[PDB]
Write an enzyme that holds these catalytic residues in place. Structure first.
Site, short mmCIF file in Angstrom:
data_model
loop_
_atom_site.label_atom_id
_atom_site.label_comp_id
_atom_site.label_asym_id
_atom_site.label_seq_id
_atom_site.Cartn_x
_atom_site.Cartn_y
_atom_site.Cartn_z
N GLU A 1 10.73 -4.29 5.93
CA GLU A 1 11.33 -3.50 4.86
C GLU A 1 12.85 -3.54 4.94
O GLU A 1 13.43 -3.37 6.02
CB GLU A 1 10.82 -2.06 4.89
N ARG B 1 3.72 11.65 12.62
CA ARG B 1 5.07 11.12 12.45
C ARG B 1 6.04 12.09 11.77
O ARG B 1 7.20 11.75 11.53
CB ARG B 1 5.01 9.78 11.67
N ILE C 1 0.25 4.35 6.24
CA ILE C 1 -1.10 3.86 6.52
C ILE C 1 -1.14 3.01 7.79
O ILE C 1 -2.14 3.03 8.50
CB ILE C 1 -1.66 3.11 5.29
N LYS D 1 1.18 -0.19 7.81
CA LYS D 1 1.58 -1.49 7.30
C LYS D 1 2.43 -2.24 8.29
O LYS D 1 2.04 -3.29 8.79
CB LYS D 1 2.39 -1.30 6.03
N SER D 2 3.61 -1.69 8.57
CA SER D 2 4.60 -2.35 9.40
C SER D 2 4.10 -2.70 10.80
O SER D 2 4.35 -3.80 11.29
CB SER D 2 5.86 -1.51 9.48
N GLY E 1 0.79 -1.22 0.00
CA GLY E 1 0.00 0.00 0.00
C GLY E 1 0.82 1.27 0.00
O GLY E 1 2.04 1.23 -0.18
N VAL E 2 0.15 2.40 0.17
CA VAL E 2 0.83 3.69 0.33
C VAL E 2 1.47 3.78 1.71
O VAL E 2 0.90 3.31 2.69
CB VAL E 2 -0.14 4.87 0.22
N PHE F 1 5.22 2.39 -7.46
CA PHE F 1 5.96 3.62 -7.18
C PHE F 1 6.49 4.29 -8.47
O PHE F 1 6.32 5.49 -8.65
CB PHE F 1 7.05 3.41 -6.12
N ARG G 1 8.21 15.85 10.98
CA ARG G 1 9.02 16.84 11.70
C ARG G 1 8.22 18.11 12.01
O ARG G 1 7.11 18.28 11.49
CB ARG G 1 10.31 17.16 10.93
N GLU H 1 6.65 20.22 9.19
CA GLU H 1 7.15 19.66 7.94
C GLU H 1 6.01 19.41 6.97
O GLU H 1 4.93 18.98 7.36
CB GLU H 1 7.89 18.34 8.22
N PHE I 1 15.85 0.69 -4.91
CA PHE I 1 14.81 0.27 -3.98
C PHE I 1 14.43 -1.19 -4.21
O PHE I 1 14.17 -1.95 -3.27
CB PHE I 1 13.57 1.14 -4.16
N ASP J 1 6.52 -7.47 4.36
CA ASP J 1 6.27 -6.05 4.16
C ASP J 1 6.64 -5.68 2.72
O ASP J 1 7.81 -5.51 2.39
CB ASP J 1 7.06 -5.22 5.15
N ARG J 2 5.62 -5.58 1.87
CA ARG J 2 5.74 -5.22 0.47
C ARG J 2 6.12 -6.38 -0.42
O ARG J 2 6.99 -7.17 -0.08
CB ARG J 2 6.71 -4.05 0.24
#
Lengths: 329, 320
Positions: A39, A175, A15, A17-18, A11-12, A127, A177, A180, A84, A117-118
């Site tokens: 990951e 999550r 969200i 995932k991990s 996914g994006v 991506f 900064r 940011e 990646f 994961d992915r």
């Protein structure tokens, strides 16, 4: 003999995932004995003289600033996009030798669950597709990426994570900064691309092919809609225009007559064969981490399992231990 | 049931593999040429111009742009591999007869994903990281594959490359020499895997290839073809580098997995050599002579027709 259910969570980013994967691996979470493959973060930052995470977003700054030619900026971006992919391809080459065959939907709880994961689709298709639609990458670069997607052997299950935009941005916000900025345009594009993926697999599972509706389909305006927040969804019965295949009917791949070259057709043939074996599902991650883990967990009865032996199952466990220790921070 | 022999003609450039291939097609024989149009014509960039023009560094950013272009060389190879692998059929066997159909491919995916790059970190134009990147994308060869590496004495090779260049041109002789070494390492790797051994057999007792090994791998005639090669004569040897080991000098498991993949993906490649000293018609005769030693698969009528369609299309779309 050992029954195995393998799940790629995708996914994006931002969200949940991990966190869901880690809870699923926990043991406090019950169910089947589960193995988590995180990951490949060390691979990207820590194992070589470069941080690919740095480069990626950074190149998008250097290009904005006027620090590197836009012709060069599409080229070094692409190379990082490529990097990646590497660790996923390696994990895939390794573990496919161990799942075994005999894909079936057996309904019962497996001896053992693997959670990744992915899937390699994330870095070879989704991506890059996003980046092409935003104009950061060319068709030729996208094709370079897409061609490197490996075939999923029998038995695979992919769970695409979903979440309403509000909460998703809210999750990134917490999550982030100080004050940011969040790249709303990228997330919006990435959210549609993943719906296009879910749609694609549905399309292919209903026995349809990328040609079914190709002549009728307009040329890919299309890129405007691809960046439009919530322009795409999970569709009951998908039509060609709701899937990834639609972005490939563009001028760069066509005749003078307006017919796709047979060689790019071969490319769409390969993308089809490669996604065939991915049994697809949706999981809403609205809950807490515990509840998320349960939403995914309850999809098991419809999931595909392979039969493997005790020695391979052990080899999958050492793999996970090896991977977790070699990929951390 | 149609009996098919597929052969991949490969090696360093400028020896005459395309020429040999074209002559073999004039047992019926199909020839899949290089994806020249794909590389030069079909898209805004020219990857052959690019990788040369990017060497206007003659030193750190070039290494990333040349590595991206290498990726682009590979694309049409992965596309052709995915389309044809479906059609070859199984039942691989060295039957020693003339097959109903023979397929000649100009180069195998191994050239663009392994030989030219895949640790082409050798000349220092590309890094081990960028290398692992290409090597990982090497597709698995299904049963029945045959690879023929073209060899040529260096004098006649350099002559051929020279009698092909214009007023103010160069030949990357140092690249040519390295490629000639890497392709010997490729030949040796297949003999080694055929010999029954695995990359781990000899690994501990092999010196850490670091700095000295790279320099040796760029010298003319530094490597040769050997039927029983040492680990150091193979492509496996270049990955024992400090960059891939932990503190205590053992290779990380994830990197080991990459060697297994490379190993496994090369398994079904039956390797041969061929000297291309003669005329175009003699070279083809040399290659034709290896036919009865090669693997053949059993395909159906519908698949062999699809392969015949494949070559017509490919010759049609990939020219110039």
């Amino acid at each position: 003999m050992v029954t195995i259910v393998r799940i790629y969570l995708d996914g994006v980013y931002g969200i949940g995932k991990s966190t869901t994967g880690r809870v699923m691996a926990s043991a406090a979470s019950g169910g089947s004995p589960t193995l988590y493959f995180p990951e490949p973060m060390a691979y990207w930052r820590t194992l070589f003289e470069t941080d690919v995470i740095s480069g990626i977003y950074d190149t998008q700054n250097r290009k904005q600033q006027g620090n590197l030619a836009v012709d060069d900026a599409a080229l070094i971006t692409a190379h990082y996009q490529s990097r990646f992919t590497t660790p996923y391809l390696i994990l895939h080459d390794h573990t496919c030798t161990l799942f075994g065959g005999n894909s079936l939907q057996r309904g019962t709880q497996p001896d053992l669950t693997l959670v990744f994961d992915r899937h390699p689709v994330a870095s070879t298709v989704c991506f890059p597709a996003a980046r092409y639609l935003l104009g950061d990458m060319s068709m030729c670069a996208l094709m370079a990426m897409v061609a490197t997607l490996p075939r999923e052997p029998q038995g695979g299950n992919i769970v695409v994570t979903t979440l309403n935009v509000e909460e998703h941005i809210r999750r990134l916000r917490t999550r982030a900064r100080i004050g940011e900025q969040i790249d709303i345009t990228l997330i919006a594009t990435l959210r549609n691309v993943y719906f296009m993926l879910v749609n694609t697999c549905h399309f292919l599972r209903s026995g349809r092919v990328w040609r079914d509706g190709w002549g009728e389909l307009p040329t890919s305006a299309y890129k405007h809609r691809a960046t439009q927040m919530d322009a795409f969804q999970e569709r009951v019965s998908p039509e060609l225009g709701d899937t990834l295949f639609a972005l490939f009917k563009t001028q760069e791949l066509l005749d003078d007559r307006g017919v796709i070259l047979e060689v790019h057709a071969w490319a769409l043939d390969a993308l089809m064969l490669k996604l065939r074996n991915l049994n697809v599902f949706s999981a809403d991650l609205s809950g807490t981490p515990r509840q998320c883990a349960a939403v995914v967990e309850s999809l098991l009865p419809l999931m595909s399992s392979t039969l493997s032996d005790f020695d391979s199952a052990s080899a999958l466990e050492r793999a996970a231990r090896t991977f977790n220790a070699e990929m951390g921070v």
